[PDB]
Enzyme design. Structure first.
Site, PDB file in Angstrom:
ATOM      1  CG  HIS B 173      -2.142  -0.860   1.034  1.00  0.00           C
ATOM      2  ND1 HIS B 173      -3.412  -0.345   0.890  1.00  0.00           N
ATOM      3  CD2 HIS B 173      -2.272  -2.206   0.972  1.00  0.00           C
ATOM      4  CE1 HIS B 173      -4.273  -1.337   0.754  1.00  0.00           C
ATOM      5  NE2 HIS B 173      -3.607  -2.476   0.798  1.00  0.00           N
ATOM      6  CG  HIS B 235       7.218   0.737   2.014  1.00  0.00           C
ATOM      7  ND1 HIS B 235       7.337   1.972   2.611  1.00  0.00           N
ATOM      8  CD2 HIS B 235       7.168   0.967   0.681  1.00  0.00           C
ATOM      9  CE1 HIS B 235       7.354   2.909   1.681  1.00  0.00           C
ATOM     10  NE2 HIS B 235       7.252   2.326   0.500  1.00  0.00           N
ATOM     11  NE  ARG B 450      15.999  14.353  13.697  1.00  0.00           N
ATOM     12  CZ  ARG B 450      16.571  13.533  12.827  1.00  0.00           C
ATOM     13  NH1 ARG B 450      15.936  13.120  11.744  1.00  0.00           N
ATOM     14  NH2 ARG B 450      17.815  13.119  13.048  1.00  0.00           N
TER      15      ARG B 450
END
EC number: 1.1.1.49
Lengths: 467, 467, 467, 467
Positions: B173, B235, B450
């Site tokens: 996706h 991914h 972060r």
């Protein structure tokens, strides 16, 4: 802070009244000159500061908002009328400089704006008479730097016997110095363009200098030299040196001129089968000067084979550039005013895009507008693997102001050396001797065209792909 | 031209009602689907086309201009209510597809939008009853593809025993398909970026996937898997393969997937000393969810050491990438939404600019605001050799629409293969087994920060130069 | 023909009576000198040709077969007794030179075999009186070339004010001229060793100069200089330049010396943390001189920190050599006599041989037993893919005879230049001033050992992989 | 242990009685076969172990010292007389195999030594009856592998429908497997030959296979195939793949054959303008067979255009080999027996040695007298910078014994795969179809000559520099 003197030798000439006096105007107006600077115009015909002002102001691009400055600058100037080959005149000039505020302590900068036939005397009488024993002395010498290896060798030997290389500033009016530094930072501060700047990736280098105007009026002066001596031997060869040089040990002027002279040493003499010479002819369909050819000027001797266009292929025969052509293409009365460096890169090894790929290009354009871009290929938006060619940009006193300012600053990097000029003349001397011995006829090309088609054929032959 | 059927298995689920039905909406509305394409939802709960429409329209993002077109789409769909593990239901579904215009001749495309624990049954039944004897059959398999090498191996062995690789479409996706093609055309159609894509020039590769939101609501489902299986194993590793792959023999899907699996075959198993794992806690400061931590979610089990952030250094041990770090940094509840590829290049060999140059970077940002730009040193406008860093840009259904289109067109390049997934799980299985055996505590980091600073320390250790 | 004169300034010294007179004897015996050559010794003590013969024959290494030829040699010799700082003596020497067969037309070659403290005078007198107005004049200058940058600059400025670089021949007794030419042809005539000769492939360069003997007898003279000035600043640095130089524009001496000085220019000053200094001590066990240490020699001043061993890491900070260490390791009273260039190459990117491969090496051994060999990996005979390391060979007056021949033939390539020597002293001057200011104590190492272990530690630290 | 059976299918054939039985002789005598290995000859004609012994011993090359071992070998063998297309005979063979010590548990290795027109039957029967349910089953298949892409595809599809690639062993009698490992260790374990193994440095690759004899009596069998199918499509193409392949992910057989097929995939189909075909004709000046031409053999059909020599230029159109010629020169009745790989490297970029350097070469000679040597320029001893070409050497059952041993060991690296063979036939099928359609006449060349001169012209055209 130190007081300076700017001695314009032959200040009555056209070059002085049109390009040098306006340049020191623009340097003083912009606050770029040192505060204590004097301008001493020295020439033969008797003139005054008022006469110089009257005959030079049209080229100053004067504006009413700064007429006050137009006084101050002209209160900083002086004139000396004397022969170029008379020791008494140079004694008067030296006394005149000494008769200034700290004139003896001043740094003297002689800009030789006078015909080269009397350089020998002028460079001579300066050394005994008009030198400074406290500040530095620097002479700016304009082309022609001779016309052969022998003539340039004798003139350079004379000047180097009198002055040293730290005092000689041989100027190039067409050197941007802004796209030159752009070249150096591009190929030396970046790893993107470092490894690819060699044989394995670059197919050919094209160095262009096109002018859209012919030789109107002053065609007789261009006749005795030709476009190879006029633009190619001096300017385009320096651009080749900048493109092809190795990384210097530092950004020092000497460290850069060493690499440039090494590149020149790696270039062999030019062969006439790598040269296409052209001459522009009138265009019946033209409007102004375009309808008159090179031989149509009454100042050009009849039946003159002087080339107004030249395409010459050179080869830097070293480890980085062996077999890579360097096409110097220069011309007058062409279609456009252009001056750029163009690197085609090789085709990618192994095409998975079905011969849709075009050779990558790196273009560093200097004229008319400065630019640095790369023609690479990006994926065409859509659903498909079909690349398309895209031009991507990678990028204010003008070039001449920043060149006179270098002589003040002592940055002698962008001026040709003596051994550099010797190699430059070594490369082109046999070809020029052949040209003015056999007297071949250059290919006639229409005014405003792109030049002889034989030039295009030659670039295609040496390995240049045009889309 | 050929008639198609789109079977949404588990159409009552959230994935179908929020992501798949709107996607086939946007594909049919934009005229991208083949004209004769049928949509067949199949689920357990007794529903109708009207119920699907009611549950689906709010996410369709429709407009009054095309509402009539809506009817066409909803005149094109159908529903079947049946258990996922009942052969009679699959026989009814196959008959229902046969009870359509050229249903027997249609190409069947099954989107498995149902929990993975049921896959082993559904695929079996799909092979038993609902396959097409004339047109092609293609299944779209949703992650998770198992939890480790063993579970993925058994699931892949089952699916490959039933279907072949030409019929399996494991969907990602988060894969753009748009910036991936930019990657491939940039590094394979251009000689500028060809020779520099190796050890000699690239210092490190950073593959990033940050999300500014946490695991709101569905935090329990994320607990059993972790961010390594969620974003990094599937991914970011595919992004690594696309960056590090050799040039394929062609743009064919198989020729690209071979290079991807070859890149995966030379990545060693991940060591815990190259991994930094973090968990987001609440930014008391405040906001909305920012003030709720991962463990503050009532659905998350107490004392959960599931990492919501991971920075992992990989090494592709081959001739092109030996010693070059590949830092996969992924995280949830980070400061920004970002997914990009960053290549720092090495410092130029020999610095003539007094340590003013910064490492060149090539950035291919996939989301948000797709971009391809190089940070390189250009000449600072002015008078001197002063390099300054400059960002130069080198650069439409969204990623998901273009991915369902691939299964229709048969472009299987951007879907993970069986052996490619096997290598992907081989790389990460020992590390995940260690994590869920020893149960180390991840570093807590503030929501909206972060990530843990240990990730920055790890990148600095492996050779990442941050300015 | 072109009658020559060989003037041995200081013919009564040990260097002339042991190394120079035998060398010209072997050059005349082998028929290598020009036919019309005269040898004019010049010294202070009143001697004759018979006295020179008596002091010289034991070192002539002659045989009864060629004794008659020996007579011919001594028929070409003459002697002049005069002070080194007396213009009258030089006038007599010039008159004697003219009182020869075509002495005025002869090419004069002065070998300065006298202490450097007298050089400043002698050269001056040589320029005043003993110059030749027809043939060339060449001076051979022995080390030391000063003690640091300032002293060397003073002496070089004096000699360059008198003579030009075409007349200065600074001799290096340790330079082979034979394996230097093998090195140049190896790395410049072959494409095998061309591309790999850079950062990308070479891990470190090791330049070695070991002597198995100490400083017997003449230890006081070595005390004031040390091993860095003795062997490292002059010889090993020239070997470094030959290894690291770019391909010259030609095989001309100037074109090679330009590349050598360019390599020197991009070497930074030496830091004391890259230096290991050692001093040899008595190997008690020993046998001969091995039982006596450096300080046990009565002529060495007590408490002397003079280093008889040095391992120094340099870095040629340019495009080809950035980051590659250059370990100059020289020493006296070491385990063996050796002088070689050793290049380790990097490990192969991607090891498919289970870490069985060792770094490839290229070794150019100059003495003893001149050789060129590569240590690479060849398949071990048998049934298996297990590589094994194998040494593969890739390969006459001695070095000194071929060096005096260069001054006759004008081949000035293997002699150090003024700017070359300036850069060489610039590199080592801060380190030497620090050494003789702080006076650190060198590591004591046993006579006949391999040197201090800190040198091995330093090489391992900088990236030298010893198997 | 793990008792083995070696089934020689067609033990009455010439290949079995002259090459296979002697090879298993030399494998058992040298103690290289596993201890419990059975040999089972199977053929049509009714024979016994004694008959096989009688027809085999003359080719066994036995000695009286080991004759005792001989009975052991012949106490180890057995014979089965059965038709090749009779299921009863194969059931009998399987029962006989089971009627051995641990015959059911034995690993069966079928060496198909029978005409290829029967293969389609035999393999089928082997799968039906003679397979082993416990140990592995491996078939060794001999060329021809079809006549073109269609026939090879049919045969390969049949065999792959029956067996898997782990069971198929397509044998190459000309593959050394000893110098192939030398190639791989040379170019993959060494950094000397790593970076230079590409377009930038290699000019051309010459793969040679010459035989000093012509088809003696079996010219009828050679007529239907030609030298392209005989030696070039199968052997020289595998040599090309080994030379041109990228570094595999490991030394695994699959990882190497993947690179081989990847190299094959980027070779375009052969064009007739890159092919020189020749036929040998009798030599009046010869003594034995040299005076008989190819068409002088009574078994060769009249007017046969079968090429006994072929020189074919291929191009691996990928990143490492784009534009580099691969000249496959194979021939019968040539001047010498030879099979080697020759790489010329490019001329050094920038010649400072006055056009004296010759292109470096790397030669890997497989037969006769296996060697690995580089021809490079070394400095000629003397006083001068003139290089000379020098040959430097860089370097036991024979190849066939080590190939049958590979099938026992399971090493499938040196056998051609199904997709490898498919690409190999794809490359050569259009050219062979054109040859058999148009029937061009090959250039006649003298027996014992070097081949047609057109081959030399073709190599010179493509970029082969012969000195």
């Amino acid at each position: 802070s130190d007081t300076h003197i700017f001695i314009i030798m032959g200040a009555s000439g056209d070059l002085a009244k049109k390009k040098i006096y306006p340049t020191i105007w623009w340097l003083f107006r912009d606050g770029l000159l040192p505060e204590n600077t004097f301008i001493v115009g020295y020439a033969r015909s008797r003139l005054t500061v008022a006469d110089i002002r009257k005959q030079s102001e049209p080229f100053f691009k004067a504006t009413p908002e700064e007429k006050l400055k137009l006084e101050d600058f002209f209160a900083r100037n002086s004139y000396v009328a004397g022969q170029y080959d008379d020791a008494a005149s140079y004694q008067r000039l030296n006394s005149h400089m000494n008769a200034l505020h700290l004139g003896s302590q001043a740094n003297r900068l002689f800009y030789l704006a006078l015909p080269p036939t009397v350089y020998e005397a002028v460079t001579k009488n300066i050394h005994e008479s008009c030198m400074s024993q406290i500040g530095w002395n620097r002479i700016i010498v304009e082309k022609p730097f001779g016309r052969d290896l022998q003539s340039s060798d004798r003139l350079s030997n004379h000047i180097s016997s009198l002055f040293r290389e730290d005092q000689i500033y041989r100027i190039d009016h067409y050197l941007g110095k802004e796209m030159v530094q752009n070249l150096m930072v591009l190929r030396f501060a970046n790893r993107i363009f470092g490894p690819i700047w060699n044989r394995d990736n670059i197919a050919c280098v094209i160095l262009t200098f096109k002018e859209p105007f012919g030789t109107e009026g002053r065609g007789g002066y261009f006749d005795e030299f030709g476009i190879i001596r006029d633009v190619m031997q001096n300017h385009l060869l320096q651009m080749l040196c900048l493109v092809a040089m190795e990384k210097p040990a530092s950004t020092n002027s000497d460290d850069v001129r060493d690499e440039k002279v090494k590149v020149l040493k790696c270039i062999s003499e030019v062969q006439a089968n790598n040269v296409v010479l052209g001459q522009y002819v009138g265009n019946p369909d033209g409007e102004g000067e375009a309808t008159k050819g090179y031989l149509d000027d009454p100042t050009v001797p009849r039946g003159s084979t002087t080339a107004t266009f030249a395409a010459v292929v050179l080869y830097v025969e070293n480890e980085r550039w062996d077999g890579v052509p360097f096409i110097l293409r220069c011309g007058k009365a062409l279609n456009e005013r252009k001056a750029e460096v163009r690197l085609q890169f090789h085709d990618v090894a192994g095409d998975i895009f079905h011969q849709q790929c075009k050779r990558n290009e790196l273009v560093i354009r200097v004229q008319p507008n400065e630019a640095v871009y790369t023609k690479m290929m990006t994926k065409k938006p859509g659903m498909f693997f079909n690349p398309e060619e895209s031009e991507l940009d990678l990028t204010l006193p003008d070039a001449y102001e920043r060149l006179i300012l270098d002589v003040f600053c002592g940055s002698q990097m962008h001026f040709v050396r003596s051994d550099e000029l010797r190699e430059a003349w070594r490369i082109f001397t046999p070809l020029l001797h052949q040209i003015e011995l056999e007297k071949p006829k250059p290919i006639p090309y229409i005014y405003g065209s792109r030049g002889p088609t034989e030039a295009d054929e030659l670039m295609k032959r040496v390995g240049f792909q045009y889309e």
